[PDB]
Symmetry: D2
Subunit: 440 residues, 4 copies
């Protein structure tokens, strides 16, 4: 599953439909990024630029011109074809092939952007620009506007209005097309297979980074070369560190390991967390904390639907957590009073859910306290956790336990679809899986 | 093998020994780097900062103060310990533990750098600063100097002299300690095992990126989490593109695949290229080009020693190439005349060797045309190649063939040691390896 | 005559009336400017900031908030009162006195602008900002918007729309109130008295800068401390250099001197040019060129009225010039053909008229080729000139003659009012004035 | 008196003599400065650039190359000759005439600086650059060094050492040549004539700015077009504000007026303060404060000589002030105890003396608390003052009195020469002068 040329074109037209007549929208590619000295990180296209193009080169700018309410056209600035650069660093789309390949009306060399952009903006009323996103893009836009402001003797005029297109575009991204959902479904399946593999390979004495290697190998073999975020493999006390990415420790018999990892597939993020015993068997204490986190997740999965909100479902989770922690003696008091004082927060200190898409923490307005009413087409995570610090003032057997369990879902007309339920999370199913792998 | 605290301290003292009395050297950590939106790339410490510290955090600055010819001391600025940041994003060294851990005299919070740096530079004659390396570092240094210049009423004085320490430090890095050579030896072995694995796993119909996944998995399992540069897997015509990193094509029965990949192990780069038949058997044409590149490499490996140079060895390679290409009819004419007109250059268009170390294209002065005389302790690559474009005006059977074969060596008192000879390169040994793997 | 508090308030309200509901306009003061080292030029307030405030301090920002269509209010950021700064550098308005003095609703310390501006912009739809006018102002606005964009967890929202208020404000400035016309009338009278004085004081052997001194002394004595632009005193060949400001030469018996000078009175510019014989008597050649320039000006003064344009009046001037130059043999050919080839341009190479107000080259849209139809309340200059280079291919006696004659006018319902006719320009009146002064 | 070509050349050679072999010094012109919109302030050349050139154009850079200990040469970058720019904005020196005019070896177009500077710095060991002085200059230098650092394949090398030439050059400027002293002597005489004129013209009912106009007219007529700093005319309570430049008030019968004004003559500053009765007659109270300030100045003038210091002479002044203030009841206590508690500071809150030259607050190291031992050739001001605030807790008759009296001196082998004693300061001489002028 992928997003095709025709869909990128639909998205461009949908933006144009929201634009004022006599306007242009400017969407810039990500800069290349240095890793060390002359070596660069593998290129990651800007998500919004990607959303409108599926084009994975730097030094590119998409310009959508809406001349009036019936007439509009697109211009791409992109790197020229060049024999030498290409023998060295790889093939480039160039200007001749871009209109057909990407479905844009015209393509021009990026090297000509300062000579051409002001001419495209001349006489328009509005420019849509994500100001502050990239310095290089701001310099280009500001230069063009300055040329226009200062060019009345050449009969040039600058648009007086600049509108940040990010609110509009991010609202577009918040609601996934069926094709986007198919891509995310595949991302979830690829990520789930990776997590299953990690559970089947995990043994005491392996390093945390060994499970990262298994996971990334599984991503790669399904054509998801890169993770959507830095993989977390937190065994023992490291599980209580939320974005532990060192993954440098030997995994001990008797500890849990929390793995949070997700692929990037055709631009889209998977995002799964599973926590499991390194030796294949939960201790009583581990199981007691695990069951509360799993109940939180299972309840959330039953509830998420159109018409509720992250805030509302979070309230149910908080009650489940406070109740379970009181029962174990980790919290003490009256449940409702404890809820009223947010007594869960030392152990569950993050949000239950974030939007998911071209970024793992995807764009889109949440509303105050994530109160926005859910509608079909929204994609979000569900990730309750409990983290009991090594020095927490709690019954000793719970200290140093960090558990999160995270699935990715799409809101549908009838509730939700779980994209990541193909990797197990019930404790008895985890143990069975690991027992089977451990027998060879 | 690794580099220890005591060695980082030796390097600091060796810099200090080269410093003027009444001076301070400022060495800044790399900034964190955005991958997309709020997600960052896995952190890569600046190589020179690493060289003096082995410390893998951002927002850190090493200050070496040489008060006079007998007295000197070190101050580290680094991130404070902070409960919340640490629960979220991970553990930090902090100020209390840094002096013992890193072997510095004093540690201060990075948040205090603007309040403290000018006081450390007050009254010194010289500041050593790699100006232009990082914008954030330049801002900090320029602010401190401005405070001093403008603070005569507070009895402050700025050092009038600023010296770029990069020439001195890069000359230090050019000559490896025995411990560094041990680390590089391990990098070479890890990288070689990865390349062997790729040869054993490769089958027609696999995607180029599948071999990248095998390679990166092998790096990881030996504790080299990250590659030292973006892996190249160039099959068929893609082999003629020097830094082909798309690795997106299905590998065809009958094509060669060129794999250029290297691990980063304790900061140090491996860098190996092997080219081999996708189906396990060189065609006659492939073998004919391969033999010229292999002869170039084997001859270079015999020759490299103290007292020669990359330039001198390159001349021998050029003769081997021109000779072989004439013999095959790819070039036509008199060998010596062809050499005199650099007739090899359409097919061998890059350098034979680059320095290797904490960067894959390592620091250090090459001399004009890489004429610097080699000495023991220098580490370099040897990477002849021949690339015959799909449309080259040559006998048809050679078109679209891209071959490079690259080993990493250390110059020793008696010649060189090949760090990467544990992965095969003789064509009959490649075929035997692949025949054996292909039988299961 | 001046502009009062109530008028600045009217202007603020007129801007607000043009603003969208749910918006704020930000108007920044000019930065102080270094002359040398720690010495600054005398402060000149930004013209648009001045237009809305009459406030002559730096580090000030006017914020006009239009909450909706009935409710609006103003906030000033300005320097705090401070005993020491004030003993040293002078009195400051401060926060307590500003609301009454300036007629703003609230005043806050400039030192708090970054802590307060984002709170004023939170939740608005539109921000009006003259982007690119000042770097310091851009930094402040961009920081505030970034805080808002990034502050959704604090329930902050940034306005997505930024509109340059300069087009609207400059259209306001283009049409003068009766009070503004009274100020400009006084500026014209002060400037005229200065030019009369220069004519009465001028003698061969005086330096050009001596007339500048007379002029600036006369400005000052009427309470116009500063000129509105750098004074030009171009004698002999220097008259052919349009913005000759060196004023360094001894004025010779037999040469003309061109003086272009204007006062700045309550923010408003005068702008007068007179050219006259250094020795009090035009030569025949000088008089011949002078008469053409004077005819051009007198005709322009008869013509300028509502319903014509600078372009239309320029055409009449061009015909007068071509005709006169043909008659003298400076041009040769058919007048209409010469006009059609713009043959006057080597001798008259600038515009006839520019708008006049708070800047000498005042703001406001001219239309293509200055074709905008004139309306009452517009204020402009009328400044024909002829400049015959020392090496021009023309009858010898005309070489090195530079003449401009410039008056300032206001368009009225019935034509125009000449604000600067109190300094003579008819050649016989110039000679009479100078003859009288030269007798003592 | 002026500074000639040969002296600018001597200064260049004296810098070169202090430079390391294999080095270049870069001295940049001041940028032009905006006054409002498209109008600029009258150009003021950077003092250090002026010191080495006497050249009053922007977009110019002096490059002094010291190839080794015997061979050196100079290159100027400066604006090209251009017909149109010159018809408009004035004459430019250009490249052809510069070597002879300025006495430099070579001149190149400023437009070529980025193409040429790196070639001049290639292979040198040291670059002398006043980093942080001007942004435009820093950009140019940083670009050149970056080209060199990154150009090893083109056999380019950057100098690793950058030295701020300001300490060396400012020490040069601290010691005046006999020619510089002659220029300063003339500056002092011009300034003194201006102050005499102000005393002779001053009448109750005139505005403070009227005396500014008289002063600036007198500067101008002697060929000092511009003041060296913004003129202060502080009558009544305004005299207690140290840099009162508003000069906006009507001068009252019964008040003193403090005038601090100085010309700029051939680049060099005068700096004189005189305080006198607006009505020509000191009141008893005014005279009582005046006598203490005059005693302070007369004593300082007797004392200043080689071998003393500003600090030492300041101590004598402080004693004079404390003594006089005790005698009048403004201070109460034991003189020595009062001195020990710096009890004078509410009334005398600034320094007694600053260096004087191409800047009014001239460059040069003062030593801690201005303790540097004075030597012949140093030029400084002597400016005791007493300022009694309107609300000071002192005998009523002294409130609102601000008096400073300031002369400019040169240290000589035998003491000092007073450059500004030609304007009176004894109270009886002030009254006599004013009585005579007031009679007509
Ligand atoms: Cl391009
Ligand atoms: Cl910190
Ligand atoms: Cl403030
Ligand atoms: Cl130029
Ligand atoms: Mn996750
Ligand atoms: Mn998540
Ligand atoms: Mn390689
Ligand atoms: Mn290599
Ligand atoms: Mn004018
Ligand atoms: Mn004009
Ligand atoms: Mn003074
Ligand atoms: Mn002074």
């Amino acid at each position: 599953s992928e997003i095709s040329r025709q869909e990128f074109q639909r998205r461009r037209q949908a933006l144009v439909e929201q634009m004022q007549p006599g306007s242009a929208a400017l969407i810039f590619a990500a800069p290349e990024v240095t890793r060390s000295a002359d070596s660069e990180y593998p290129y990651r296209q800007n998500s919004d630029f990607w959303y409108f193009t599926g084009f994975n080169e730097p030094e590119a700018v998409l310009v959508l011109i809406k001349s009036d309410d019936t007439h509009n056209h697109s211009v791409l600035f992109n790197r020229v074809r060049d024999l030498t650069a290409e023998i060295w660093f790889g093939r480039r789309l160039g200007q001749d092939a871009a209109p057909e390949k990407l479905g844009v009306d015209r393509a021009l060399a990026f090297s000509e952007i300062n000579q051409q952009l002001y001419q495209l903006l001349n006489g328009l009323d509005v420019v849509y620009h994500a100001q502050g996103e990239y310095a290089y893009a701001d310099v280009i836009v500001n230069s063009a506007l300055e040329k226009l402001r200062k060019g009345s003797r050449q009969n040039l005029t600058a648009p007086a209005t600049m509108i940040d297109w990010r609110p509009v575009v991010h609202e577009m991204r918040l609601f996934k097309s069926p094709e986007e959902i198919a891509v995310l479904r595949r991302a979830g399946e690829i990520t789930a297979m990776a997590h299953t593999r990690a559970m089947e390979k995990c043994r005491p004495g392996m390093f945390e980074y060994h499970l990262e290697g298994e996971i990334h190998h599984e991503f790669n073999r399904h054509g998801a070369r890169y993770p959507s975020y830095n993989t977390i493999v937190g065994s023992g006390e490291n599980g209580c560190i939320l974005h532990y990415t060192e993954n440098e420790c030997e995994m001990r018999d008797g500890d849990l390991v929390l793995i949070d990892a997700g692929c990037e597939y055709k631009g889209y993020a998977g995002d799964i967390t599973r926590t499991f015993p390194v030796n294949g068997k939960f201790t009583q204490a581990q199981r007691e904390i695990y069951d509360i986190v799993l109940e939180s997740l299972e309840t959330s999965l039953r509830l998420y639907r159109p018409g509720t909100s992250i805030l509302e479902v979070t309230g149910e989770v908080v009650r489940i957590m406070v109740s379970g922690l009181v029962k174990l003696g980790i919290l003490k008091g009256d449940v409702d009073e404890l809820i009223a004082q947010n007594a869960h927060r030392p152990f569950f200190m993050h949000g239950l859910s974030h939007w998911l898409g071209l970024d793992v923490h995807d764009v889109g307005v949440y509303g105050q306290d994530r109160s926005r009413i859910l509608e079909p087409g929204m994609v979000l995570t569900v990730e309750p956790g409990l983290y009991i610090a090594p020095d927490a003032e709690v019954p000793e057997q719970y200290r140093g336990i960090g558990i999160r369990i995270e699935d990715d879902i799409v809101i549908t007309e009838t509730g939700n679809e779980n994209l990541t339920a193909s990797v197990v999370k019930k404790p008895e199913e985890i143990e069975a899986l690991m027992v089977a792998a451990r027998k060879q």
